[PDB]
């Protein structure tokens, strides 16, 4: 599911699923 | 950052995992 253009909440949800308990950071301007 | 790499171009597992903690 990761190998596509992912924008907005779509990208956030991919990060959430992949990173799992490591958690993540979403910085859409940096 | 992640938007350039995954929204305006095609994402990859490698790039997502760059943003895990
Ligand atoms: Ar999410």
From Swiss-Prot, chain A:
The chain holds residues 25 to 54 of 105 of the full protein. It comes from the Eukaryota. It comes from Bos taurus. This is Insulin B chain. Transmembrane segments: none annotated.
Curated annotation (Swiss-Prot), chain B:
It comes from the Eukaryota. Disulfide bonds join 6-11. This is Insulin A chain. It comes from Bos taurus (Bovine). The chain holds residues 85 to 105 of 105 of the full protein.
């Amino acid at each position: 599911f990761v190998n596509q253009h992912l924008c907005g909440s779509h990208l956030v949800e991919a990060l959430y699923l992949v990173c799992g308990e490591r958690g993540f950071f979403y910085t859409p301007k940096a | 950052g992640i938007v350039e790499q995954c929204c305006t171009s095609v994402c990859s597992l490698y790039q997502l995992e760059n943003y895990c903690n």
